Structure 1
Amino acid sequence: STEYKLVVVGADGVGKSALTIQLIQNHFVDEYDPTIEDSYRKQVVIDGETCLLDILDTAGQEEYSAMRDQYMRTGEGFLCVFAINNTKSFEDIHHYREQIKRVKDSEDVPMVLVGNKCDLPSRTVDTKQAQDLARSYGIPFIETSAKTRQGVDDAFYTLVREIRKHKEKMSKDGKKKKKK
């Protein structure tokens, strides 16, 4: 069945790992253990298709940009995670997207904007500005909590759906031809 290369990106401490672990292992990591680079696979059924999810869980801050370039090249789809009580992490999304587009040398890259930690009262990034940004990029926005698991499956499943749409659009192309 179809394999999907997903990459989870975002600033230090937004909950990239907690989201990924909730997805894979169904528990919430309460600790803060900074990531170098972790990879996971989960077989799931999404819209009646069996998917092999190959998930890359990236570091909050890359020491070597070459390490960032590589996962942006390999990734088929990107989970762009910010925390709703971390304004800078939300601002960092623009910079991730620019870096990904440049590396892919393309304007069309499957991504989903993820506002994590929605269980907190400390919200400094409002939903509207998140929604506005996602609308601007033409990608989905999903609010999640790794603590409660709210929205976690949805975030990953939606990314898979985005990758499918892209594959279809890339077969049909926009020009240079073609496919139906």
Structure 2
Amino acid sequence: AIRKKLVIVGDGACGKTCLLIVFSKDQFPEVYVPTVFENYIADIEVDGKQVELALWDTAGQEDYDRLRPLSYPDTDVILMCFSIDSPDSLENIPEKWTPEVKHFCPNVPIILVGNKKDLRQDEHTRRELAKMKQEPVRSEEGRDMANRISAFGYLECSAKTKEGVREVFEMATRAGL
């Protein structure tokens, strides 16, 4: 089996931990969500290769932010997340996440991930964003950002419905390889 280190980053509450959990446990967490997922190695088969993915969760609330840069050494692939229900989180991709990741992880491939895709057509989300003269992130905007930061790929998923979750890790593995 091939061994790869994956680091997930992006704005607070954009769904990083839930994404890791749904991929690892095949269940969206109702009941409890930790700030960061437990130390975990996932198994995935991609293109007839067995690979082990160390899943490094990160966060931003006070202490985890200082811990975050210490997590970048020897990363093989980055999941760089924003939430489709948060245009703000998308704008933070070129302003915060890409400068940080490019600094600590030169040459490391990035999968730009649009989380919470289930909220794109959500009435409540649309009404809330409408008061800001905003709307959920369009897939074309996701793609354009991926192009702009020279991501390896752009993917959308919903940890909540599981839609697209497996492909995120499959693409990340292919990049990591």
Change (3 A) 1:163 1:134: same
Amino acid at match of 2:155: I
1:37-76 equivalences in 2 (<5 Å): 38-61=38-61, 63=63, 65-76=65-76
Per-residue CA deviations over 1:21-65 (Å, capped at 9, x if unaligned) read 111111011356351463211122111100011101111435365
Listed as ranges, the gaps of 5+ residues in structure 1 are 165-180
TM-score for both structures, normalised by structure 2:
0.83
Amino acid at match of 1:143: E
User: Within 2, Cα distance between the matches of 1:156 and 1:62?
Assistant: 28
Change (3 A) 1:6 1:25: same
- Secondary structure at 2:19's aligned position in 1? helix
Whether contact under 8 Å (2:59, 2:65) holds in the other structure is no
1:1-180 equivalences in 2 (<5 Å): 1-31=1-31, 33-36=33-36, 38-61=38-61, 63=63, 65-94=65-94, 95-104=96-105, 106=106, 108-120=107-119, 121=122, 122=125, 123-139=135-151, 140-164=153-177
What is the number of residues matched between the two proteins? Answer: 162
Structure 1 residue 87: Cα displacement: 1.8
TM-score for both structures, normalised by structure 1:
0.82
- Secondary structure at 2:73's aligned position in 1? helix
User: Within 1, Cα distance between the matches of 2:62 and 2:48?
Assistant: 37
Aligned-residue identity in percent: 33
Q: Which of 37-46 and 150-159 deviates more?
A: 37-46
Listed as ranges, the gaps of 5+ residues in structure 2 are 126-134
